[PDB]
């Protein structure tokens with residue numbers, strides 16, 4: 457039933473806010489929190505993400521976290537900013553200076569208890585909490601360090617609930633500081649241990665999509681975050697609308713994750729919008745499987761698919777959908793592991809997103825994701841072999857040993873992906 | 880994991896305090912040693928001048944006992 461949403465830091469809070477705008481529009485909820493839709497299908501499972509307050513008001517089940525105030529002031533002034541509950545804003549003053557150790561061990565620790573109090577108050581009033589989703593980046597200090605601290609405390613107090621993240625992975629092509637590879641390696645180590653599902657969103661890929669396909673000479677953060685919000689809408693559609701299926705986050709996890717550590721998913725979206733030509737089912741199918749629509753900069757022909765979910769939205773022929781999904785599997789069979797039968801699953805929702813007649817969202821558990829971690833590992837090593845920029849971290853109390861251990865964990869994850877790719 | 884988190888934050892506190900301590904003691908040693916050296920320089924100069932005044936007295940006491 458109920459999901460609790462958490463957004464931490466600058467990146468996390470910008471994409472989180474965009475997510476709430478898009479889905480609030482789909483459910484017919486305006487910025488004041490009043491329902492003005494045309495169809496009972498919009499409200500029948502509204503309670504998954506929204507609480508009902510007095511006056512038939514709908515309030516997002518959302519907690520907003522940062523170590524500095526700036527971005528949460530921008531949220532509060534943003535177009536839908538009044539819809540969030542005021543008591544759910546939890547912010548410090550110091551900042552974390554793009555420093556994972558400040559987020560995880562010093563500045564963040566002072567705030568974490570007050571954040572957990574609000575989480576507990578939201579969970580306490582849930583009829584039947586299914587679990588949690590977190591939005592954050594891995595390259596900074598607050599979302600990365602404090603986000604993974606939060607993940608650890610939530611597991612300790614709610615050990616049998618599902619913990620899911622949408623995680624933005626750094627790239628030198630879109631970079632704020634040189635230390636991003638350190639912060640990302642430290643964070644992945646935590647995710648391998650403490651999440652059930654992590655959507656890998658690579659700023660490299662989002663940039664290449666804006667540049668090559670959508671034709672934009674200077675992509676802003678706003679342009680990248682538009683794709684992210686559309687993808688997240690796609691991926692939560694099956695819980696959010698009456699589509700026959702009787703599912704919860706745990707049944708989805710059981711269907712998608714064959715080994716506990718290999719739970720990092722590659723998202724995609726079709727069609728890519730910045731037009732009027734409607735799109736045939738063959739075209740949706742061909743484009744959703746195309747490398748160029750993937751949100752993690754990995755070649756799926758360089759690995760094999762452990763599992764795939766496809767979600768189609770809009771009015772279309774289910775016969776034709778089945779035929780096209782079968783066509784792609786039968787003609788490209790070598791990229792799908794033979795030892796998990798029937799590992800491609802398909803959903804259809806009648807309600808299309810805003811501004812499109814037909815769309816498709818892709819979720820892949822592919823061994824080609826090892827390419828992303830290798831990237832990060834090389835950037836890590838190039839600095840760590842000379843200890844460059846380490847004094848920022850040891851000054852907050854960390855030893856070199858912790859860096860060596862994190863590096864080892866991530867090289868092991870890569871080796872595991874390779875083991876299942878050669879089988 | 881929680882106990883490790885406590886050890887990290889305590890190590891950070893400890894290093895900041897140790898830096899403050901060592902800078903305070905280094906400064907105090909320097910500012911004492913400099914005072915002692917300067918005072919010794921001035922005391923040697925004054926002592927040389929007083930030895931000069933003593934010699935001038937022995938000279939006038941030589942000229943008197945000549946006559």
Ligand SMILES: Nc1nc2c(ncn2[C@@H]2O[C@H](COP(=O)(O)OP(=O)(O)O)[C@@H](O)[C@H]2O)c(=O)[nH]1
Nearest residue numbers: 465466467470593595596597598599626630677
């Ligand atoms: N896609 C995307 N990436 C962002 C955004 N803001 C920051 N980043 C990236 O996230 C990393 C910086 O982390 P940031 O969120 O600013 O740090 P924090 O505030 O301490 O959590 C870098 O890789 C940036 O390129 C955003 O709005 N969208």
Ligand SMILES: Nc1nc(NCc2ccc3c(c2)OCO3)cc(-c2cccc3[nH]ccc23)n1
Nearest residue numbers: 589620691692694695708709711712765801803
């Ligand atoms: N694992 C997994 N798969 C998904 N895709 C669709 C699907 C349809 C039919 C299926 C199926 C999967 O698996 C077997 O039948 C979405 C999600 C998700 C994640 C995080 C937050 C979420 N809020 C709502 C949903 C969701 N999580």
Ligand SMILES: [Ca+2]
Nearest residue numbers: 550562563566
């Ligand atoms: Ca403080």
Ligand SMILES: [Mg+2]
Nearest residue numbers: 466554596632
């Ligand atoms: Mg930043």
